[PDB]
């Protein structure tokens, strides 16, 4: 169970880190318009 | 943020005053701090800059190596009683178990302090005689202070502006590590416990567990 807990914990913090740094990676510049 | 030239930030900010003329601002970390005039001439400045940067790298390695093993001791790596506390780590070689890297008996497991010092003398003497001279079996012409080449495997030091910015990061991180190494040396003597132990005592009750509790402990008493 502890091995499963460490596995789910690293999976969740990996995906949440992807979300955090993806929205930090200049997101208001992804528009297809002018401005 | 203009880390070079006359418009660089100085060691007192808005109240800095006119920096010394030899500290023009062409070298990394130039905060215009030479109040004792040690580097008026170029040669003392070059030698002192070498002492700076060599000490900076030695202190970065030192600060990480003082922080790491006692952190791992708190993590479950089994250092018994003195391999955790940095200033007592050297005393670990005399115990019946020897000196075990990461607490495992299969790792290192050293018993001869004379042998480990002798191997270190020949290795570091060759390395430092090579560093001073600027020649080795495989490298011919390299900067004595910023060598590179085989010392830059990742190609990180290529383009001059990134090189200079990383030099500023190097010198400032090194100065911070030198400051913390002075801190480790002083808190070792006056408290008698590890640096992270000092931190966790300061994290429990900072209002009383600080450096002011250990001020009266060195009063010479008749």
């Amino acid at each position: 169970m502890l091995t499963l807990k460490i596995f789910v914990y690293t999976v969740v913090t990996f995906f949440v880190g992807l979300f955090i740094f993806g929205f930090l990676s200049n997101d208001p510049s992804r528009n297809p318009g002018k401005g | 943020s203009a880390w070079y030239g006359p418009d660089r930030p100085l060691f007192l900010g808005s109240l800095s005053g006119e920096p010394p003329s030899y500290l023009t601002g062409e070298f990394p970390g130039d905060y215009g701090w030479d109040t004792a005039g040690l580097s008026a001439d170029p040669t003392t400045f070059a030698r002192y800059r070498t002492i700076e940067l060599i000490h900076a790298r030695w202190a970065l390695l030192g600060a990480l190596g003082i922080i790491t093993p006692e952190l791992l001791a708190k993590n479950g790596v089994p250092f018994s009683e003195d391999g955790a506390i940095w200033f007592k780590a050297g005393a670990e070689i005399f115990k019946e178990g020897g000196l075990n890297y990461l607490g495992n008996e299969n790792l290192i497991h050293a018993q001869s302090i004379l042998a480990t010092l002798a191997v270190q003398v020949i290795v570091m003497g060759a390395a430092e005689g090579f560093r001073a001279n600027g020649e080795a079996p495989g490298v011919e012409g390299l900067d004595p202070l910023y060598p590179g080449g085989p010392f830059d495997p990742l190609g990180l030091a290529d383009d001059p502006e990134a090189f200079a910015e990383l030099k500023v990061k190097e010198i400032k991180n090194g100065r911070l590590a030198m400051f913390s190494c002075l801190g480790f040396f002083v808190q070792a003597i006056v408290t008698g416990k590890g640096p992270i132990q000092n931190l966790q005592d300061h994290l429990a009750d900072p209002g009383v567990n600080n450096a002011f509790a250990s001020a009266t402990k060195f009063v010479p008493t008749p």
């Binding site: 169970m1 502890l2 807990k5 460490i6 914990y9 690293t10 913090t13 990996f14 880190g17 992807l18 955090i20 740094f21 930090l24 990676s25 200049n26 510049s29 | 708190k74 993590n75 479950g76």
Partner: protein
């Protein structure tokens, strides 16, 4: 006792970490994502 459990419920357990390796891998994984993000800068 008849069977082995974590018994991590309650206790005000920060981030739900009962062993330090959990906090270490959380910090380490956020650090790896930050490392790739940071080195992959000065782009676009």
């Amino acid at each position: 006792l008849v069977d082995d459990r974590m018994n991590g419920d309650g206790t005000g357990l920060p981030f739900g970490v009962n062993d330090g390796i959990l906090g270490w891998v959380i910090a380490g994984t956020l650090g790896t994502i930050w490392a790739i993000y940071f080195v992959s800068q000065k782009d676009l």
